[PDB]
Amino acid sequence: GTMEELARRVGRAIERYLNGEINEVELALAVGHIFRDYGLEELHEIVDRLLAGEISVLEMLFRLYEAAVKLGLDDLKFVLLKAIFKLLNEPKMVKIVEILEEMYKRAVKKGDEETIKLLKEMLEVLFEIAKAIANNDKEEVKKLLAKFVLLLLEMVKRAIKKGDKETLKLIHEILDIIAEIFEELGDDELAHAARLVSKAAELALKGKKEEAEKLFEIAEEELKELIE
Numbered sequence: 001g002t003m004e005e006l007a008r009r010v011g012r013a014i015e016r017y018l019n020g021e022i023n024e025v026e027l028a029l030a031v032g033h034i035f036r037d038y039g040l041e042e043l044h045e046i047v048d049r050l051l052a053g054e055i056s057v058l059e060m061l062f063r064l065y066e067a068a069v070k071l072g073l074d075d076l077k078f079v080l081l082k083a084i085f086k087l088l089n090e091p092k093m094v095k096i097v098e099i100l101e102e103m104y105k106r107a108v109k110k111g112d113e114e115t116i117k118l119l120k121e122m123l124e125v126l127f128e129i130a131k132a133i134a135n136n137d138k139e140e141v142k143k144l145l146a147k148f149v150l151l152l153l154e155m156v157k158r159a160i161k162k163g164d165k166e167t168l169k170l171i172h173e174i175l176d177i178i179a180e181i182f183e184e185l186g187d188d189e190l191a192h193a194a195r196l197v198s199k200a201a202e203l204a205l206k207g208k209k210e211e212a213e214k215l216f217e218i219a220e221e222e223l224k225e226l227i228e
């Protein structure tokens, strides 16, 4: 079939594995069969390694995401990222990925193609965040999240000059989750920058978009200082 149903089938298989309905060998066999049915041999060879016991579920998910990036499958990328951030116990990152998927789905049904690139770059940043979390590199996670907040700031700046309103609400929700994550990581300046960007977005959405700009410059300057 189409690449839309492949992502749904793979997501259902991984969800069954995570909920405990099936085991590792059953998951490997089912996902390999799904990949072979759609003609994707490169993903099938990766799943063969999990079937052979060489690698684990998380490493296989990472390799599958890297291969899907090269192949250009987007819904598969979102499914794989959600599965990765569910294997590592982080509900907040899963919520961020869910909101990002909603924005991508809204963007693909219209002519907006500039936001697709932004969502791709932020997917790259989130993948790097997951890789740093897997290595327990807590210093790199903060820098990657700062880059993610800068990308969200770029998106909100682009959206304000347009008529989009639900984009502002989704970005505000994402920024609030990011600020909560920063607070739980024992940081306050980056959390303050995230909340400043969120406040600017909310002020622009409310109707007062003149006070939003000074907040935007203040927040971006602070983020650039804290990235170094």
Ligand SMILES: [Zn+2]
Binding pocket: 032, 044, 045, 048
């Ligand atoms: Zn095989």
Ligand SMILES: [Zn+2]
Binding pocket: 188, 192
């Ligand atoms: Zn404070």
